[PDB]
Design a protein around this ligand. Sequence first.
Ligand SMILES: CC(C)N(CCCNC(=O)Nc1ccc(C(C)(C)C)cc1)C[C@H]1O[C@@H](n2ccc3c(N)ncnc32)[C@H](O)[C@@H]1O
Ligand SMILES: CC(C)N(CCCNC(=O)Nc1ccc(C(C)(C)C)cc1)C[C@H]1O[C@@H](n2ccc3c(N)ncnc32)[C@H](O)[C@@H]1O
Length: 329
Amino acid sequence: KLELRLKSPVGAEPAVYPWPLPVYDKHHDAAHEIIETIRWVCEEIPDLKLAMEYDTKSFESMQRLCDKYNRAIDSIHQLWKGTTQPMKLNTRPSTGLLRHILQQVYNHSVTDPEKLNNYEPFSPEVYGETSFDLVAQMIDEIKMTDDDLFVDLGSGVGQVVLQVAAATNCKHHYGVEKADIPAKYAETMDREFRKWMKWYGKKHAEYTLERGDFLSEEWRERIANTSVIFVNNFAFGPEVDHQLKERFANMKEGGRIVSSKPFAPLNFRINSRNLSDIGTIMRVVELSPLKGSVSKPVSYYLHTIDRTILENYFSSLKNPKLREEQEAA
Ligand SMILES: CC(C)N(CCCNC(=O)Nc1ccc(C(C)(C)C)cc1)C[C@H]1O[C@@H](n2ccc3c(N)ncnc32)[C@H](O)[C@@H]1O
Ligand SMILES: CC(C)N(CCCNC(=O)Nc1ccc(C(C)(C)C)cc1)C[C@H]1O[C@@H](n2ccc3c(N)ncnc32)[C@H](O)[C@@H]1O
């Protein structure tokens, strides 16, 4: 048996790979994961990048790369023992590193990715090469603080929950998934994610990947108490979207829902016939699309619970002037 090992930059257990190096799918294999890990650790640590003064099918050539990386790591650990300051260990991963870490967690967790169903509207042979970016855009645009609770509704193997948990301060992040196959992989994604984040010396916020149905009664109260919801509802039917509207109607003021299809018209106009529709209690905006993203770019929608829309309508009805105007129609 032959092996390649990469040392952890913070002294966790080394990553070990058998030779020949495994292929994970049509676009991912262990040789590129190794090269990319080396590259990313070099971004974490300048002196390492400096000190790194390649045929992926030659063992010797790949061992010469690993050896070189490992010797460089040893010398950086020595440097840290001296007066030099160690790497800050309390930090979150940059977006780029997080993309790599999640690909790596997915590689080791999702043993047969063909079993998982494609998430419309994204490409099926792409592994989040745009969904990852959209979520990244949202993480930046949506201020989240430690008083927030986050849910991804229908969370698959947990790819979005783990991204968001790596990046934000929400008190807790949840994913709820209904199907056996994705739920089982989520169990492993969790394990591998905790392990690889330790390996790179990075922190995440608390999260839980749970098995459940988000239309169940247990999730009624839980949706009600969530302040940020992500849901890729583009392919949902009108019955399921309707049931979600019922749940969203119980959210607290300021609650936010980001979706791929809006749950209410963007120019909702409140009157006697639409008094009970969800548009009476939320602002809806079309978010800024991300250049370099086909499906015409991917559009996405932010809803904010705001009952003052409804308060003003009722106040307007008490005013006989405004009341007469509305009765123009
Ligand atoms: C091969 C994998 C990626 N699989 C998609 C599984 C769901 N997507 C998913 O997990 N994306 C994802 C994965 C990782 C990340 C992170 C990087 C961790 C953030 C982010 C997003 C393939 C599914 O699409 C189908 N598929 C594959 C190729 C094919 C085809 N050319 N045309 C039609 N459908 C096809 C296949 O039947 C499976 O249902
Ligand atoms: C397409 C959605 C619905 N989902 C994707 C899983 C990965 N998460 C994901 O893509 N999140 C996400 C990505 C991007 C965005 C934005 C772009 C920001 C809008 C928002 C959210 C699919 C999973 O949801 C599950 N699902 C569907 C209904 C069902 C149910 N009632 N309770 C439990 N889980 C259920 C289904 O079994 C799949 O595993």
